[PDB]
């Protein structure tokens, strides 16, 4: 078992040029592969989730080149649905942004492809997406547990009236939205009830429009899609810096700054996680917005009680920042933390208690009362990049912290610790 120990950080200050957005990167790669023409993506993220999408495209026969640092990608579009037969197996790690979108896209036309991944991915739900794709004509078989990968996709999605449950993941709707335009018949996607992680649907529609397709959004309750469309290369496309990766650095300044500026995202960004800065401001930090940066300067840090359904990923960063805040913090409406890289409500509560906090693990919320002083702990990371990144913030105190399996940050941010060290100051 590998581990890294972080020494106490006296102050943070500086500038970080963010790695690319995982959410934007994987949508842009799949749409570029489906499109007609050559797309050049710049500021693409090099991380495990993106590498699994790149490997899947390679296996499906898509041609592309990558720059030395893997952040520039020139993709030759396929000019239509991707195909493979012989139950070709695509291994997708634990990347939901590859698994869910490919599960839908590869239902176009005929195919015989198996999608699988790491053990945890075989425990992450996908039944709501499979149910919707089958209503549209797709033939899909669960090869192991019903409602979970691995899946054998045999094609057949033609369109029509499709209901989809949006209560567990917005990714099922995202996957349907990206796929339906290329189906032969028009599709009407009806949301059954609640829709979680709503801002990610806006990212999907933004990327689809960049690739030449628009649909009719009826107040996020129903989406009307015309079939028989084609995606078209946008030419050169700049992937935004990752706003979820930014959260650690902005929070570090709110706790121990100094001023920390992150570049690559700004006031015009499409990612919902830029709203994480609004939470730091509500807690007492100062935020500055630019066209291509967001900065945070230390002010004070008071506890908050907020529904975080709009920023589920960056919300984990508030759970460890809460260790430094005055009062009890409560993060609500975050049930799907349970069905992601690990059950995050259980993991976050367990590790927070190890450093001294009193924590109530609610069914779909977490309440955190900080200790007077933190103690040393060896933090388990649950094969979850964000558990490693969130607990790195414990070192902005008088105590070191040991993080187990630090390389798990590679799911979205391989260079995380070197970047945190870049803004760590001794004086
Ligand atoms: O569509 C996307 O890019 C994502 C949507 C979210 O998942 P849910 O919709 O399941 O919350 C988020 O947690 C994930 O990291 C990225
Ligand atoms: O990045 C995160 O915090 C959660 N990702 C879930 P996935 O992208 O694998 O569906």
Integer CA distances (angstroms), 352 to 45, 342, 390, 392, 409, in order: 30, 15, 10, 12, 19
Task: Please state, in angstroms and rounded to a whole number, the distance separating the CA atoms of residues 99 and 122.
Answer: 11
- Determine the CATH number of domain 20-223: 3.65.10.10
Let me know if 313 is a catalytic residue: yes
Per-residue HEC secondary structure of the chain comes to CCEEEECCCCEECEEEECCECHHHHHHHHHHHHHCECEEEEECCCCCHHHHHHHHHHHHCCCEEEECCCCCCEEEECCCCCCCCCCCEEEECCCCHHHHHHHHHHCCCCEEEEEEECCHHHHHCCCHHHHHHHHHCCCCEEECCCCCCCCEEEEECCCCEEEEEEECCCCHHHHHHHHHHHHCCCCEEEEEEEEECCCHHHHHHHHHHHHCCCCCEEECCCEEEECCCCCCECCCEEECCECHHHHHHHHHHHHHHCCEEEEECCCCCCCCHHHHHHHHHHHHCCEEEECCCEEEEECCCCECCEEECCCCCCCHHHHHHHHHHCECCEEEECCHHHHHCCCCHHHHHHHHHHHCCCEEEECCCEEEEECCCCCCCCEECCCCCHHHHHHHHHHHCCCCCEEEECHHHHHHCCCCHHHHHHHHEECC
Ligand 1 pocket residue status of 94, Cβ below 6 Å:
no
- Contact (Cβ atoms closer than 8 angstroms) between residue 39 and residue 235: yes
Ligand nearest to the CA of 168: 1
Residue 338 assigned as binding residue: no
Structure tokens, 347:
């993991």
Question: Does the fold of domain 20-223 match that of domain 1-18+241-427?
Answer: yes
Q: Which ligand 1 atom is nearest residue 336's CA? A: 11
Ligand 2 centre and the CA of 385: distance in Å? 9
94 lines ligand 2 (CB under 6 A): yes
Q: Whose CA is nearest to atom 5 of ligand 2?
A: 340
- CA-CA-CA-CA torsion sign (71, 76, 81, 86): negative
With a 6 A CB cut-off, is 313 part of the ligand 2 pocket? Answer: yes
**Paired tokens of 353:** 């208690």
Q: Is 317 in the pocket of ligand 2 (CB under 6 A)?
A: no
Distance 18 CA to ligand 2 centre (A): 18
Residue spans per domain, the chain: 1-18+241-427, 20-223
First to last CA, the chain: 33
Find the ligand nearest to 26 CA: 1
Q: Is the CB of 169 inside a 6 Å radius of any atom of ligand 1? A: yes
CB of residue 382 inside a 6 A radius of ligand 1: no
- Which technique was the structure solved with, according to the deposited record? X-ray
Q: 318, 308 in Cβ contact below 8 A?
A: yes
Is position 197 annotated in a ligand binding site? yes
Q: Has domain 1-18+241-427 been given CATH number 3.40.50.1980?
A: no
Give me the resolution in angstroms, 1 decimal: 1.5
Nearest CA to ligand 2 atom 1: 313
> In this structure, how many other beta carbons lie within 10 angstroms of the beta carbon of residue 377?
19
Q: Within the chain, what is the greatest distance between any pair of CA atoms?
A: 64
Ligand 1 centroid to residue 170 C-alpha, Å: 7
Q: In the block, which residue shows the tokens 């107040």?
A: 219
Closest listed residue to residue 91, CA positions, set 66, 127, 64, 122: 122
- The answer to the question of whether 340 is labelled as a binding residue is yes
Question: What distance in Å separates the CA atoms of residue 357 and residue 344, rounded to the nearest whole number?
Answer: 16
* Catalytic residue from among 48, 313, 384, 405: 313
Whether residue 411 is annotated as binding a ligand: the answer is: yes
Q: Is 242 in the pocket of ligand 2 (CB under 6 A)?
A: no
Does 170 count as an annotated binding residue? Answer: yes
The H or E element containing residue 87 is none
């Amino acid at each position: 078992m590998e581990s890294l120990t972080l020494q106490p950080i006296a102050r943070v200050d500086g500038t970080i040029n963010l790695p690319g957005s995982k959410s934007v990167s994987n949508r842009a790669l799949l749409l570029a592969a489906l499109a007609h023409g050559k797309t050049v993506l710049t500021n693409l993220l090099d991380s495990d989730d993106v590498r699994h999408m790149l490997n899947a495209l390679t296996a499906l026969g898509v041609s592309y080149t990558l720059s030395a640092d893997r952040t520039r990608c020139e993709i030759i579009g396929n000019g239509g649905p991707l195909h493979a037969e012989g139950a070709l197996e695509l291994f997708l790690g634990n990347a939901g942004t590859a698994m869910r979108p490919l599960a839908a896209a590869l239902c176009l036309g005929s195919n015989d492809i198996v999608l699988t991944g790491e053990p945890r991915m075989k425990e992450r739900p996908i039944g709501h997406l499979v149910d919707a794709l089958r209503l549209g004509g797709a033939k899909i078989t669960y090869l192991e547990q019903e409602n979970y990968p691995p899946l054998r996709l045999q094609g057949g999605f033609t369109g029509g009236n499709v209901d989809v449950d949006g209560s567990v993941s917005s990714q099922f709707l995202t996957a349907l939205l990206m796929t339906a335009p290329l189906a032969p018949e028009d599709t009407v996607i009806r949301i059954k009830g609640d829709l979680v992680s709503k801002p990610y649907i806006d990212i999907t529609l933004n990327l689809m429009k960049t690739f030449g397709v628009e649909i009719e959004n009826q107040h996020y309750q129903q989406f009307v899609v015309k079939g028989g469309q084609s995606y078209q290369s946008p030419g050169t496309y700049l992937v935004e810096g990752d706003a979820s990766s930014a959260s650690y650095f902005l929070a570090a300044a709110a706790i121990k700054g100094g001023t920390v500026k992150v570049t690559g995202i700004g006031r015009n960004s499409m990612q919902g996680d830029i709203r994480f800065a609004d939470v730091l401001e509500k807690m007492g930090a100062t935020i500055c917005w630019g066209d291509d940066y967001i900065s945070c300067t230390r002010g004070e840090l008071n506890a908050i009680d907020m529904d975080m359904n709009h920023i589920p990923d960056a919300a984990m960063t508030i759970a460890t920042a809460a260790l430094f805040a005055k009062g009890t913090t409560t993060l609500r409406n975050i049930y799907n933390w349970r069905v992601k890289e690990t059950d995050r409500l259980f993991a976050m509560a367990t590790e927070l208690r190890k450093v001294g906090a009193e924590v109530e693990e609610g069914h779909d919320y977490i309440r955190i009362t900080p200790p007077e002083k933190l103690n040393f702990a060896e933090i388990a990371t649950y094969n979850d990049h964000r558990m490693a990144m969130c607990f790195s913030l414990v070192a902005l105190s008088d105590t070191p912290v040991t993080i187990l399996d630090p390389k798990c940050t590679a799911k979205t941010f391989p260079d995380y610790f070197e970047q945190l060290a870049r803004i760590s100051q001794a004086a």
